[PDB]
RNA sequence: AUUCUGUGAUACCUAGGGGACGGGUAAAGGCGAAGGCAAUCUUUUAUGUAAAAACUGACGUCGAAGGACGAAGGCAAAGGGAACAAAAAGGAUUAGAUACCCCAGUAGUCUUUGCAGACAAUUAUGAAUGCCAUAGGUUAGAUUUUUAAUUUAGUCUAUAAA
């Protein structure tokens, strides 16, 4: 029966090469199945629009949201460039100042994401601990 | 026969020192280096007898010492192999990749 | 995020190395051989296989080079139409 | 945790765990990509000596233009093949 | 329970390897100079590789490949030893310890401003 | 090499104290008369920009002098002192080496109050007004059939007439 397991491996292998999610109503031509189209030359998962305008919220008024701060910093606590956020310069400055305020006020870490957010993310039982040592 | 050769780049290791980097060598270069080591050990040995077989038999005896592992050429093979392992990182040294890219 | 700029007038629009200057395919094999000698030793038996692979390199012929890439010819056709001009 | 407290330090953010679909060799590759995207190595090189404000401002202008010129050059190279494909 | 640590500090001129207990008490704190490498021979990639292999060997003698069930690898600095020692743990020497690794951390020290550094050197 | 270390260093930690500095964001980006101004909260201050109306009704521009402001270094006084670092000094390199490099290191940089007024204080381009054809970016708004165009005020790139 082991000969059936390797088939599942070969199947999922090809499924990884089909770098496209078909949806209902999507029109396709014989060209949309060739490698040039499946390769996905686009090396960037660009954002559609400025979410700050689409969600219509003032960043500075939402500085107390720990999840919102961790969303606009890298795992190392560094504010994300406008390339990753896809925001206008005006909205980028409001979200950057919203992160600096939370970190400056001392309610959010500066070199990683909030501890309570790390408790939920994968690697919960593996988080670095502090042995009392005494 | 060794498997690598040590090429040096002039003035790229520091204060006028060279950057030694190993590289592979084809068969003819491997056999040529090997047999020339054997002849180097042969010429330095003393004379034994007389006749037309002096040089021939003196070389053949060294060929046997090599197969038995008791020859001196085995040291020269391991000596050059050490330089290769001791410099395997120079293949990507900053000097070998920054010749004229620091205007 | 802004879009790519329109290049200023250049003397010539071209890429330095049109064809990818691929690396000798065996310099990677030698590194593996040099890696075993550091961990398993020189006169060991484990490295007896990698050495055979290294000896197999030089006994094989060198692949022939690919035809030149005509990218630079087409870049020179669309320079004035793609940039702000051409410097004299 | 309730019994032991988490060690909150800069290394806590630069941590990558080993799991089923990610082994030690896989966590190293992920650690290198994130350490590169965050330019940790560049900061260690820039923080080794002091650069007064004027020199830092002028160094950024030179590097920021080479980045726009390079980005605008890749757009012209690929725009040339969009036209060549059409047959122009 | 916190794992053991395998700190690997490496800079331009030397590399330090420290194996600590869960409470971060050093068990094996060695450097390239402990193997006899003198003033300038400590910066070589090869010398950092032998230090890694030496530490791994000394761990076996202490019977740590059986005592250590969870271990963390902490990297500090971008010297030659950062890659050399990794190929020891990832190679044939760390065969016994490779299975007990659960984390891979980077502890390179950066300053957000901080004290002023040396003035730039004029080598020419 | 001087130098640090068996009076236990480097490395790895725990617990306290101190001083400055300001990572990412960040851009051809912005602000001010210029000098200059980049972590954060509250408090506080004059200009400037867009669109509509309303209001005053030439109330404008330039401006010797006087006064004010004016980078870094410096003087004076009282603090601070981690780091950096003129001076002084040591170790190297060198034909010689004050030097470039290195081990260390005092003024000084920082705080408060005055003095001082010289700068590649630069756009090597005083301020202001009327006017002259386009194109491609970018910054802050406004209008719209908010897709994208149109438009006001900035800034930069490449050109026409000149
Ligand atoms: K040591
Ligand atoms: K200025
Ligand atoms: K000093
Ligand atoms: K001297
Ligand atoms: K414009
Ligand atoms: Mg004869
Ligand atoms: Mg100095
Ligand atoms: Mg010189
Ligand atoms: Mg002590
Ligand atoms: Mg402080
Ligand atoms: Mg900054
Ligand atoms: Mg203004
Ligand atoms: Mg006036
Ligand atoms: Mg006057
Ligand atoms: Mg002053
Ligand atoms: Mg002063
Ligand atoms: Mg004083
Ligand atoms: Mg000052
Ligand atoms: Mg005055
Ligand atoms: Mg000035
Ligand atoms: Mg005037
Ligand atoms: Mg500007």
According to the 3-state scheme, what is the secondary structure of C41-83? CCCCCCCHHHHHHHHHHHHCCCCCCCCCCCHHHHHHHCHHHHC
Beta carbons within 8 Å of A38's beta carbon, 6+ residues apart: A17, A18, A19, A20
Q: Does C35 touch chain E (CB under 8 A)?
A: yes
* Nearest-by-Cβ selection for B85 from C38, C58, C59: C38
Q: How far apart are CA A71 and CA A102, in angstroms?
A: 13
Nucleotide nearest to E9 (CA to C1'): F11
Nucleotide nearest to A97 (CA to C1'): F25
Q: Which nucleotides of F are covered by protein (CB under 7 A)?
A: 1, 10-14, 19-29, 37, 39-41, 82-85, 100-102, 136-141, 157-159
Q: Does C39 touch chain E (CB under 8 A)?
A: yes
Helix (H), strand (E) at residue A96: helix A89-105
Q: How far apart are CA C12 and CA C85, in angstroms?
A: 10
Q: Would you state the structure tokens that stand for residue E47, as one six-digit string?
A: 């010398």
Q: How far is the CA of E98 from the centre of ligand 13 (A)?
A: 77
Q: What value, to the nearest 5°, has the Cα angle with vertex D20 and ends D17 and D26?
A: 55
Measured between its terminal Cα atoms, the distance across chain B in Å is 43
Residue of B89, B96, B103 best to disrupt the E interface, most CBs of E under 10 A: B89
Q: Does A79 touch chain D (CB under 8 A)?
A: no
List the resolution, Å.
2.8
Q: How far is CA B47 from the centre of its chain?
A: 27
CB atoms within 10 A of CB B66: 18
Nucleotide nearest to E40 (CA to C1'): F1
Q: Does A129 touch chain D (CB under 8 A)?
A: yes
- Name chain B contacts of C58, Cβ cutoff 8 Å: 24-27
Q: Does A83 touch chain C (CB under 8 A)?
A: yes
List the A49 CA – F146 C1' distance (angstroms). Answer: 14
Helix (H), strand (E) at residue A7: helix A2-17
- Name chain A contacts of D38, Cβ cutoff 8 Å: 74-76, 78
- Name chain E contacts of D50, Cβ cutoff 8 Å: 116-120
Closest chain E C-alpha to C1 CA, distance in angstroms: 26
Q: How far is CA B103 from the centre of its chain?
A: 37
Q: Would you state the structure tokens that stand for residue A98, as one six-digit string?
A: 């919203």
CB burial string B25-61: b at 16+ within 10 A, e below:
beeeebeebeeebbeebeeeeeeeeeeeeeeeebbee
Q: How far apart are CA D36 and CA B101, in angstroms?
A: 21
Q: How far apart are CA C71 and CA C15, in angstroms?
A: 8
CB of B65 closer than 8 Å to CB of B38: no
- Name chain E contacts of B88, Cβ cutoff 8 Å: 45-46
DSSP A110: S
Q: How far is the CA of E7 from the centre of ligand 3 (A)?
A: 29
List the E9 CA – F12 C1' distance (angstroms). Answer: 11
How long, in residues, is chain E?
124
CB of E54 closer than 8 Å to CB of E35: yes
């Amino acid at each position: 029966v082991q000969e059936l397991l390797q088939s599942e491996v070969t199947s999922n292998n090809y499924m990884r090469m089909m770098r496209r999610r078909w949806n209902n109503g999507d029109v396709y031509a014989p060209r949309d199945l060739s490698p040039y189209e499946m390769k996905g030359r686009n090396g960037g998962w660009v954002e559609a629009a400025d979410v700050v305008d689409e969600l219509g919220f003032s960043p500075l008024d939402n500085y107390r949201n720990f999840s919102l701060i961790s969303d606009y910093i890298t795992p190392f606590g560094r504010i994300r460039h406008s390339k990753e956020t896809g925001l206008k310069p005006v909205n980028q400055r409001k979200i950057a100042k919203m992160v600096r305020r939370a970190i400056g006020l001392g309610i959010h870490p500066s070199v990683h994401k909030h501890p309570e957010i790390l408790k939920n993310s994968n690697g919960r039982h593996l988080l670095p601990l502090v042995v009392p040592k005494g | 026969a060794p498997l690598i050769k040590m090429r040096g780049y002039k003035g790229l290791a520091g204060g006028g020192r060279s950057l030694e980097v190993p590289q592979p060598i084809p068969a003819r270069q491997r056999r040529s280096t090997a047999f020339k080591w054997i002849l180097d050990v042969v010429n330095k040995k003393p004379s034994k007898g007389s006749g037309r077989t002096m040089f021939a038999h003196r070389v053949a005896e060294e060929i046997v010492a090599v197969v038995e592992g008791r020859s001196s050429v085995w040291d020269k093979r391991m000596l050059i192999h050490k330089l290769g392992t001791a410099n395997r990182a120079n293949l990507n040294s900053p000097a070998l990749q920054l010749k004229g890219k620091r205007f | 995020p802004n879009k790519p700029i329109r290049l200023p007038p250049l003397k010539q629009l071209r890429v330095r190395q049109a064809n990818k200057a691929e690396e000798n395919p065996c310099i990677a094999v030698m590194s593996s051989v040099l890696a075993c000698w550091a961990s398993a030793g020189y006169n060991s038996a484990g490295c007896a296989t990698v050495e055979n692979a290294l000896r197999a390199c030089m006994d094989a012929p060198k692949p022939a080079p690919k035809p030149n890439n005509t990218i630079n010819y087409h870049l020179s056709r669309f320079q004035e139409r793609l940039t702000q001009g051409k410097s004299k | 945790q309730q019994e032991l407290n988490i060690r909150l330090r800069p290394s806590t953010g630069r941590t990558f765990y080993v799991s089923g679909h990610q082994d030690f060799a896989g966590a190293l590759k992920l650690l290198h990509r994130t350490v590169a995207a965050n330019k940790v190595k560049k900061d260690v090189r820039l923080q080794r000596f002091h650069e007064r404000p004027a020199l830092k401002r002028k160094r950024n202008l030179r590097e920021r233009w080479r980045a726009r010129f390079k980005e605008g050059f890749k757009a012209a190279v690929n725009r040339t093949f969009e036209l060549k494909n059409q047959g122009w | 329970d916190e794992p053991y640590h395998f700190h690997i500090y490496s800079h331009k001129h030397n590399t330090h390897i420290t194996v600590t207990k869960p409470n971060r008490d050093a068990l094996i704190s060695l450097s390239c100079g402990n193997l006899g490498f003198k003033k300038s021979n400590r910066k070589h990639y090869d010398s950092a590789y032998q230090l890694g292999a030496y530490v791994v060997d000394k761990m076996h003698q202490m019977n740590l490949h059986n005592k250590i069930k969870k271990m963390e690898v902490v990297l500090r600095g971008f010297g030659p030893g950062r890659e050399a020692v990794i190929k020891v743990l990832l190679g044939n020497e760390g065969r016994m310890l490779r299975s007990s690794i659960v984390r891979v951390s980077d502890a390179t020290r950066l300053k957000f401003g901080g004290t002023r550094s040396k003035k730039p050197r004029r080598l020419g």
